[PDB]
């Protein structure tokens, strides 16, 4: 009997992640859900090419919350657009609950896996995904028969599935007992990276725009006053050092103050001088 490998990965597309995050935040504090489009490239790869949201329903996030008519028209009409991808799986946002499946979630996932054996049930936490960490996990299931007979839910052939550790929260809510966490990998090609880099690419202008000279002088005065006080603290600490065998330092704070003054002042001088040269009447 074939068993899904522990090296199986869910290649979440970049825009798939973006849409999931935006829709999850929009639904806060309610729970949202949507369908995940892509293709099962092989037994060790699930490529979530795209995702489309689903209308918020009074049921919540269940298998009655998937509108068959809405699902249909969206599927045929996206196929017309140029996205003829089979529905890979579904997603729903647990706002602040962490990533796991509640009993209704496993019920809906069973409904989904009735359609196809390979079908994931990724979830995302829209509020715990603060700047930096993104709290998203992908679980498929554990069939009861495989577990009760004692066989491990997934065969192992590599360390890929053991690189990351399952969390206590998910573990208590049935992880590794009713469903397994599938490692999530983000397909991000160079083009999308370069385009995303424009979000904080400032301009060709601020590289030549001088900071306000009055504000520059006030910042410099404040920093040199702080350097005063830090230097007095340094002198007192060093005077103590002599009456001290090996047994906040004014020195470090002084050092990063020096570094900030360095960068700000040198940049201002150099920028002003380039502005003198290139921005010339001639």
């Amino acid at each position: 009997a074939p068993a899904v490998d522990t090296a199986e990965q869910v290649y979440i597309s970049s825009l798939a992640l973006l849409k999931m995050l935006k829709h999850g935040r929009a639904g806060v504090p309610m729970e949202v859900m949507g369908l995940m489009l892509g293709e099962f490239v092989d037994d060790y790869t699930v490529r979530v090419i795209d995702v489309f949201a689903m209308p918020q329903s009074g049921t919540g996030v269940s298998v009655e919350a998937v509108d068959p008519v809405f699902q249909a028209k969206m599927l045929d009409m996206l196929k017309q657009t140029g996205r003829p991808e089979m529905v890979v799986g579904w997603y729903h946002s647990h706002p602040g609950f962490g990533c796991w499946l509640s009993g209704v979630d496993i019920n809906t996932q069973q409904s989904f896996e009735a359609l196809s054996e390979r079908a994931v049930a990724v979830v995302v936490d829209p509020i715990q995904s603060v700047k930096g960490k993104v709290v998203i996990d992908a679980f498929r299931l554990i069939n009861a028969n495989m577990m009760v007979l004692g066989h491990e839910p997934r065969q192992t052939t590599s360390n890929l599935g053991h690189l990351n550790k399952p969390s206590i929260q998910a573990l208590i809510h049935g992880l590794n007992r009713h469903y397994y966490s599938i490692t999530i990998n983000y397909r991000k090609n160079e083009l999308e990276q370069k385009m995303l880099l424009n979000l904080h690419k400032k301009s060709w202008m601020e590289g030549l725009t001088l900071q306000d000279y009055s504000e520059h002088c006030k910042h410099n005065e404040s920093v040199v006053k702080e350097m005063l006080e830090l230097a007095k603290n340094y002198n007192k600490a060093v005077e103590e050092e002599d009456k001290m065998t090996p047994e906040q330092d004014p020195k470090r704070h002084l050092e990063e103050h020096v570094d900030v003054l360095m960068t700000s002042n040198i940049v201002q001088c150099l920028a002003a001088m380039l502005d003198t040269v290139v921005f010339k009447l001639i």
């Binding site: 040269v277 290139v278 010339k280 001639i282």
Partner: protein, 94 residues
């Protein structure tokens, strides 16, 4: 005519050119500022006028070529200083 090399124009220039008395250069400058064509200022002490004006004109294709050459000069100055800073900072640019 004078490409800001010597902006300060003595009242003799405006008097002979505009065929006016030096008593009236100030008046016509004030009128031109009031209507909204020029935004300069007058120095009566040294008999000079400072001009920083924002009124353009049609530009006489030969003048298009001349301004093209001026643009070329300033752009090659920009390029030269860009190579200079790049070469001097190649250690830091990485």
């Amino acid at each position: 005519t004078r490409p800001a090399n010597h902006r300060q124009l003595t009242f003799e220039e405006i008097a002979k050119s505009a065929k006016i008395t030096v008593n009236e250069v100030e008046l016509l400058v004030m009128k031109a500022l009031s209507v909204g064509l020029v935004k300069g200022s007058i120095d009566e002490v040294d008999k000079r006028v400072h001009m920083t004006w924002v009124q353009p004109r049609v530009l006489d294709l030969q003048q298009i070529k001349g301004m093209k050459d001026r643009l070329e000069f300033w752009c090659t100055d920009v390029k030269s200083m860009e190579m200079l800073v790049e070469h001097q900072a190649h250690d830091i640019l990485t």
